[PDB]
Amino acid sequence: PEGPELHLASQFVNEACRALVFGGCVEKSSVSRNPEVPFESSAYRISASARGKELRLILSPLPGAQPQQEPLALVFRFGMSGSFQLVPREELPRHAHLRFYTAPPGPRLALCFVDIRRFGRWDLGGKWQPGRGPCVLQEYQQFRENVLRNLADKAFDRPICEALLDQRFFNGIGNYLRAEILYRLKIPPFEKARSVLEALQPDLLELCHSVPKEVVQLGGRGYGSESGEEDFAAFRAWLRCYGMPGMSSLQDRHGRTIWFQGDPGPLAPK
């Protein structure tokens, strides 16, 4: 999941749970390093919101539910494969590591946080991760300021392709979005970040918002989409650069691949 997938996931939770009531406990699958979720209620509603590469769930007891519960918040990161699914209670799609169960009036479902590689995390406390910058989709102006007020930061000495993954200033931008963003403007991926940003103080900071936004409007599951699935053709078809034939690719300093076209830029690995 990148920012758009986080957003689509939060909006899926909100749509798919609009008319559901949950009940019972919050069940974490075995070998679940992540913490148990201490929360029981006989009738609760679930909602979500996204920020950057994080997603917040809110568990909200209906009036009169038992045990007494104050609404609880949980914040998820998706790692390389996190996702959410609403499934029939007994047709659990492994490796569903956290499970929320509908309550009886109706067919029994489980909302699951499904994470094959188990790189995802959650933490108790509905708090955004300290240090993540603002959301490039939902807090653009803040996002933009937090970049321009901070170019002295040594994060900006790095190639622009690397700086774009720094979640302290580009919360939500991942590996496919960085290629697509840089490609739209033909900025070499290994130009220096500060040089490309100081020019501002659509440009690069605007495309950091509207590019991931385009993916959200495709709807569907974005990068998460499955072959042959209908939203997977959409996504593949939207990509112009990331993994496309006729593009170059190189390894950045952390071993992540940056796709691009043409000039690799001054700071390339050589």
Q: Which of 61, 159, 174, 189 contacts DNA by CB under 7 A? A: 174
Q: Does 270 bind DNA (CB under 7 A)?
A: no
Q: Which of 53, 99, 144, 221 contacts DNA by CB under 7 A? A: 53
Please state, as a whole number, how many other Cβ atoms lie within 10 Å of the Cβ of residue 25. 15
What is the torsional sign of CA 171, 174, 178, 184? negative
Find out whether 175 is annotated in a ligand binding site. yes
Q: Does 175 bind DNA (CB under 7 A)?
A: yes
- Minimum Å distance from CB 55 to DNA? 12
Q: Which of 109, 135, 165, 204 contacts DNA by CB under 7 A? A: 165
Q: How many residues bind DNA (CB under 7 A)?
A: 26
**Spatial CB neighbours of 141, under 8 Å, sequence gap ≥ 6:** none
Q: Which of 24, 71, 79, 126 contacts DNA by CB under 7 A? A: 79
Q: Does 2 bind DNA (CB under 7 A)?
A: yes
Is-cis flag, bond preceding 97, omega within 30? no
Tell me whether residue 145 is one of the annotated catalytic residues.
no
- Catalytic pick among 1, 4, 61, 188: 1
Name the one residue in this structure whose structure tokens are 């700071």. 267
- Minimum Å distance from CB 175 to DNA? 3
Nearer to DNA among residue 142 and residue 257 (C-beta): 257
Tell me whether residue 2 is one of the annotated catalytic residues.
yes
**Spatial CB neighbours of 120, under 8 Å, sequence gap ≥ 6:** 34, 76, 77, 78, 79, 81, 82, 97, 113
The residues that bridge with 49 in the sheet, in sequence order, are 56
Binding mask 114-153 for DNA (x = CB under 7 A): --xxxx-x-------x------------------------
Q: Does 254 bind DNA (CB under 7 A)?
A: yes
Stretch of 20-28, 111-119, 147-155, 156-164 lying at the interface with DNA (CB under 7 A): 111-119
- Catalytic pick among 4, 5, 53, 54: 53
Tell me whether residue 53 is one of the annotated catalytic residues.
yes
Q: Does 223 bind DNA (CB under 7 A)?
A: yes
Residues that bind DNA (CB under 7 A): 1-2, 33, 53, 77-80, 94-95, 116-119, 121, 129, 165, 167, 174-176, 223, 227, 254, 256-257
Catalytic residues: 1-2, 53
Residue numbers in the known binding site are 175
